[PDB]
Design a protein around this nucleic acid. Structure first.
Ligand SMILES: [Mg+2]
Lengths: 219, 50, 319, 31, 100, 79, 221
RNA sequence: GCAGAGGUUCUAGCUACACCCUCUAUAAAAAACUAAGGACCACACGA
């Protein structure tokens, strides 16, 4: 009576490394929704990840302001920063500087290493400069958070998307292995900022969920 | 009279309560109307119609 | 019974006469009826259909496949096998329903779109499942409404049903250019609730990287579905000679309107999802999508918009 | 081979079987 | 029984022939799923040929629309019963109230 | 699998001759031993004919000239 | 992260209890509560009756003299009794009653392992003096709800729809905990309602085992 | 396997929509098998 139809991977369509679509055919009735919602919440609200949380402009102190020589407002400048996918080592916090001048876009590859900090998107655009004398420089603060911490709950404060996932949507339709009941067919499409593989991110979320029930496994 | 009858029990006088989704598990905003209405079952069963 | 007895002219004239009863429109084989069911999980190119109905309607096809595969030597043994509903028969049945359209047919076929083709999806049950979008085209309710299913037999019949009668091929009603598969009753309510705004809602004010971040905030529950927040969108326009150019800007909107942006195809502009999105707005949206993107992107967009409307109407709890 | 058979699809259990036989012809064992 | 109704369900059930109303009052000497025996009271019975009332409830019977006309007893042994009272819950009937 | 025949009708701008040509193609595939040029994906003849038309290599002119050539080598078979 | 534990099990009533899990952070509370509720309501191994044989009743719709109600109502009352077994996966319960009086589940001639948790559950009322009912109740374990019309011999055997579901109402509440020194910790209390055939602690533990094993489809231990 | 008969079963089985083998005036070594009929008027109800 304790036996269950454990799912087996059948075809995982590997979209470009920032996107994936993982599905399971067998599973159980009503278990598709359970697993889909559990994974979605568990990796969308609590995941160990690194993201920007606080930015300081050397020449700007108030948000309702803008530097000369940049066509993007600092409101939009922080918008690019919050999407900057960054992976860090055992250090829980590091300050990232972006001392750069001259005419041209400020790609994420121009961020100073400041150790072994890795940027998975060197070509990511942060801001554009159009004046030779114009210089942009800011300090970036990142921490290994455990979910999403909006700026409304707390110097320029930028929304911190610590979790590496960008979008989760599970669709549960019917799959009949052999000729049984209409068992759930969980298909999960996932998009990740790039710090970890979407498959690796789902595996990490499942490890977290099972590791949450270590004492509940009947020894 | 119906409002007073709801107030007699623990149920709210408004007649509609917050419901949580069966799958997602988080409550529906804009609390929905629930109640025990007497609904029949007509003899036009699908078994006859195939 | 003291009634006029039918003559040689009473059977050539009138409703019950040979002409209008047996020549103009005549009863047909490979036909079945049942009450209809919503089944929102379907796509408009397909419809649900009971196992018994697929077994009975496609009996000659099942017999032919059994003879071809040698499961039964003779039609007679194969017919006994179909009666026993042996498991091998169901696997054979799934092969003859892969790309075999059936003509869903409501009884008062007032106009051309009364009968449409569908790829049957084998369902366990006894009620035909009709796609929610095509209910408006069928003028079909879910209050005991029954519609017949007809099975095209010849390659010409199935092929022309697929090419012409498919609900994917019937988006604009013959009466007028306006779309006929427009979100009608519940999905439109879900979209309308989605595309609104409180003047003070949870998670209002912060700037969003894109629709993905809007979905992340809504699902996590830390931002209301409809809160006026600025988002960054990659709006695609085909102002070039068929090429789609990308325009990125911070358009003030709500979270709910940002959710729909990932649903709409690339060609559509953002000005069409930035309103309250009532029935007329959605009809205009679908018409613009058909006139710009074409047919297949319009079909995919209609399916996705139906999915999101139903899902967020369920999440809305609009009691 | 004209025996009465249950229609296809419908099922159930028989609750009673009443037999009416005209006078003159001998009734079978079940009757 | 319907939680919300009109109060005519009892009247409809009693007036219709689906239920087994008590022609004479008394006590239920013996109750069975197929029969109900009513012991008529001394002040409600005739001097001659009164005896006691016996009700043979109709069990599962084929109906005009192929439904079951089932009558289940609504009383136990020793339960007093007055004149014109409900005794068997017929089809779509609960405690003498029309329960469609 | 296929859902719509739009690109096919931009390939064949009749919506009616398309049915006839794909029906002839399906007849060739079923009655004859003709091998579909696009490899099937567990698809029926009536939809693989539309797949063939979609790629543009099969329509009325190519089908007609192909069957004409087959008839030509049918006369030439006996020399 | 933090590990929830069986901090408390408030057995408020004989049927339903109130289990408590203490250490949980943002999301975990609601996620784990909803997952546990869905697992419990979906698939919990019950021991509901599935087959009944009466001594002298031919079919499901007949009626024997001396019984208050129909055999169909007897079967539906039998489906309602809560019975749990320990050793045997399959057990046959014999019920022999005579004389006037309601036939409660307490008079079932139970075996060593099988025991009725609600002896007051009435099945039928005997009315005649010389009225005796002798039924052989077949009770087997199972998971979920399987009707008698979708399963798999003598004419005298009666089939009752199986109702293998010990739990009937699972409600969970996520509220802040009372840890020695910390914030953003919530405790999950589950107000699970059972018919009495399952221990709430073992029910929660088995549901969690099912959930954890379902996660092992792509994750190693 | 196209006009008939026979065969091991079970009266009869020759493609009758129909299932195996033989030949053109002769009957048996052989297992899976079998049947080809059926209107109108009224009532009520559903969309
Ligand atoms: Mg209707």
């Amino acid at each position: 009576v304790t036996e269950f139809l454990k799912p087996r991977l059948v075809d995982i369509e590997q979209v470009s490394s920032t996107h994936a679509k993982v599905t399971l055919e067998p599973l159980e009735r009503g278990f598709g929704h359970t697993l889909g919602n559990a994974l979605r919440r568990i990796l969308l609200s609590s995941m160990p990840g690194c993201a920007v949380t606080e930015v300081e402009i050397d020449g700007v102190l108030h948000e309702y302001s803008t530097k000369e020589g940049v066509q993007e407002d600092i409101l939009e400048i922080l918008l690019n920063l919050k999407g900057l996918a960054v992976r860090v080592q055992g250090k829980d916090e590091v300050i990232l500087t972006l001392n750069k001048s001259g005419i041209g876009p400020v790609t994420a590859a121009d961020i100073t290493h400041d150790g072994d900090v890795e940027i998975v998107k060197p070509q990511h655009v942060i801001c554009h400069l159009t004046d030779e004398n114009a210089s942009i420089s800011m300090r970036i603060k990142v921490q290994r958070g455990r979910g999403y911490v909006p700026a409304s709950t707390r110097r320029l404060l930028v929304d911190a998307c610590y979790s590496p996932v960008e979008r989760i949507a599970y669709n549960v339709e019917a799959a009949r292995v052999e000729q049984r009941t209409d068992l759930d067919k969980l298909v999960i499409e996932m998009e990740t900022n790039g710090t970890i593989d979407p498959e690796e991110a789902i595996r990490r979320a499942a490890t977290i969920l099972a590791e949450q029930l270590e004492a509940f496994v009947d020894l | 009279e119906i409002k007073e009858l709801l107030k007699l029990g623990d149920l709210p006088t408004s007649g509609q309560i917050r419901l949580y989704d069966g799958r997602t598990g988080e409550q529906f905003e804009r609390p929905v109307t629930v109640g025990y209405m007497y609904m029949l079952k007509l003899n036009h069963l699908v078994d006859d119609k195939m | 019974n003291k009634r006029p007895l039918k003559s040689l002219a009473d059977m050539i004239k009138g409703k019950q006469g040979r002409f209008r009863q047996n020549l103009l429109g005549k009863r047909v084989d490979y036909s079945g009826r049942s009450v209809i069911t919503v089944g929102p999980y379907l796509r408009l190119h397909q419809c649900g259909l009971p196992k018994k109905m697929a077994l009975e309607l496609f009996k000659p096809f099942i017999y032919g496949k059994l003879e071809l595969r040698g499961l039964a030597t003779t039609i007679k043994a194969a017919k006994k096998m179909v009666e026993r509903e042996e498991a091998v028969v169901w696997d054979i049945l799934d092969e003859v329903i892969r790309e075999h359209p059936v003509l869903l047919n409501r009884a008062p076929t007032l106009h051309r779109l009364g009968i449409q083709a569908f790829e049957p999806v084998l369902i366990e049950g006894k009620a035909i499942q009709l796609h929610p979008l095509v209910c408006a085209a069928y003028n079909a309710d879910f209050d005991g409404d029954q519609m017949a299913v007809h099975v095209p037999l010849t390659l010409e019949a199935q092929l022309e049903a697929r090419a012409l009668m498919m609900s994917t091929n019937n988006i604009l009603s013959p009466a007028n250019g306006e779309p006929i598969i427009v979100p009608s009753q519940d999905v439109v309510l879900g979209l309308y609730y989605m595309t609104r705004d409180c003047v003070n809602a949870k998670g209002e004010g912060m700037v969003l990287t894109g629709p993905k971040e809007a979905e992340r905030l809504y699902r996590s529950g830390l931002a209301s579905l409809h809160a006026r927040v600025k988002v960054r969108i990659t709006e695609y326009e085909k102002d070039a000679n068929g090429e789609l150019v990308a325009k990125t800007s911070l358009k003030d909107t709500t979270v709910g309107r940002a959710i729909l942006w990932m649903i709409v195809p690339k060609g559509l502009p953002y000005s069409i999802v930035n309103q309250a999105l009532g029935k007329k707005a959605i009809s205009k949206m679908l018409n613009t999508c058909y006139r710009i993107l074409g047919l297949k992107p319009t079909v995919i967009f209609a399916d996705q918009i139906m999915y999101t409307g139903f899902a967020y109407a369920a999440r809305s709890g609009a009691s | 081979d004209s025996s009465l058979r249950v229609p296809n699809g419908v099922s159930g259990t028989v609750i009673d079987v009443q037999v009416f036989t005209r006078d003159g012809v001998e009734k079978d064992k079940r009757a | 029984k319907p939680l919300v109704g009109t109060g005519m369900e009892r009247a409809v059930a009693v007036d219709s022939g689906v239920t087994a109303v008590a022609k004479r009052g008394g006590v239920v000497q013996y109750v069975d799923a197929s029969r109900i025996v009513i012991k008529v009271n001394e002040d409600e019975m005739y001097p001659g040929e009164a005896g006691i009332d016996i009700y043979n409830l109709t069990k599962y019977t084929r109906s005009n629309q192929n439904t079951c006309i089932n009558q289940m007893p609504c009383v136990s042994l020793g339960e007093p019963v007055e004149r014109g009272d409900v005794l068997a819950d017929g089809p779509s009937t609960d405690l003498g109230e029309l329960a469609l | 699998a296929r859902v719509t025949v739009q690109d096919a009708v931009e390939k064949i701008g009749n919506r009616f001759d398309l049915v006839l040509v794909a029906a002839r193609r399906a007849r060739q595939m079923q009655v004859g031993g003709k091998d579909p040029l696009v490899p099937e994906e567990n698809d029926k003849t009536t939809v693989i004919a539309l797949r063939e038309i979609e790629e543009g290599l099969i329509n009325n002119q190519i089908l007609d000239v192909r069957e004409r050539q087959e008839q030509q080598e049918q006369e030439a078979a006996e020399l």
